[PDB]
């Protein structure tokens, strides 16, 4: 259940801003001193990054990919990287069992030659658009304010700020998905056929 | 320092860390060596709440008709504490425990051969859970561990808003994952649309 | 009027959680130390288990069983185990008198060859579904919080919590009973005969 044992310059600027949320100064590099101030600020980033991924968003969802079994076992590892696994159409079948995909209708584990699913893959603080990269910080900037320096007046401003941020995030995909009522969907696209 | 450097931890351990971050205090490294109430406190409140989130609802949790098999010699079926809720398939469910064993409350009997067909909610770990719920199992535990122990009203009044937002994301999950249909997939009004 | 002079491991974890409700740390075994903290927590569990049974719920109600008198006496013991005793149809006849069932219409006590009733049998903290096993704890987590460590803020959260627990309990039998308006009842099942 993924570890933060590597470092990145673009991820470093996020940890600075989470430390700004208390009022703490920058940490120059995340190689480490003894401070729980910068250690908790990095974990609350990772703990919230896996929420923002767990939602929603349309670039995050990989429409039908194929997961392939180890031919000799034969099963597919359902890793903690995979945040949410559903099926393509409806009445999704798969769920983990021991860390492995498992049919809850076919009563079976072992199957050959693949599946087609929608995986939300877990990505970094990088591999994210800048709308969300703000909101991953400023949502972390609330729970890091609430767990260590819990001043009610600097949180009550920040709650208004992360809500503003999430709105800009919801502004993003509505454009980015480009979705359509009457011309792009599954049902009422078929009705407009003359 | 290094890259690429892929590595994983216990999801059970990191959940106990987030409970300890929520009350407000430094991360505890390990769980075993049964010292530190805070590691027994946070892990019990995790387990005590994981068995609620399973006790509800959710559709991957419900195993549609499985068979439970008695011994040939006794002949009864053990109804364990692991089985959270046991109902029948259709309606006017018959089964209920009696000494830890399943029991007909209509056939007035305990002993039957050749099995049943039921809906068991099986209890699973903190793992064997999707990530939407793994969040909400923590942040609901982050409230009852805050309430029962760090009894400051302002930290829970924040966190109560947070676990409710978690539950909505959880409620969002199966609505997709079940993919349920009003007029085409159900028991009654699927039959009415037949031409 | 049933005593808690036996012990159970699954019942032990309930007493732990009632002790968590103050903020007190666990008791390992219920064999006993001097503390009234664990002794009052075990009693308030038993005192509330006999309420949740006294309600309602449909697995709890045993539809018509037979109680059988001692052929030589001849009466039926109405024990304190029996929480509520009604008749099958309506205008129920039976009520205790000295600890014994008694007709309040036939003016009599002694009768031969049995009855047919709806007994709510008192069961343990075990022999309960998990929805209720939660709510038997978290209702006990209020009356144990009010009687011994009564901070008003830790009760005010818990009252919201036991209410949410009660709703999950109320959700249970609505499924588990599977009750039907127009196809399963006594009156308007008979109306729909064609």
Residue numbers in the entry:
A (entry chain Q), C (entry chain S): 3 to 196
B (entry chain R): 2 to 196
Sentences from the paper on this structure:
Escherichia coli bacteriophage T7, a member of Podoviridae, has been used as a model for understanding the DNA packaging mechanism common to tailed phages and related dsDNA viruses. At the beginning of phage infection, the tail is responsible for receptor recognition, and the portal and tail act as a tunnel for DNA delivery into the host cytoplasm. Here, we determined structures of the DNA packaging intermediate and mature capsids of T7 using cryo-electron microscopy (cryo-EM) and symmetry-mismatch reconstruction.
The portal-tail complex structure is similar to the previously reported recombinant T7 portal-tail complex structure. Six trimers of the tail fiber gp17 N-termini anchoring to the adaptor-portal interface were clearly resolved. This dsDNA density terminates abruptly at the interface between the dodecameric ring of gp11 and hexameric nozzle of gp12. The clip tilts toward the portal axis, which probably triggers the disassociation of the terminase complex, followed by the assembly of the tail proteins. It is noteworthy that If the portal does not move downward and expose its clip domain out of the capsid shell, the tail is not able to assemble on the portal due to steric restriction.
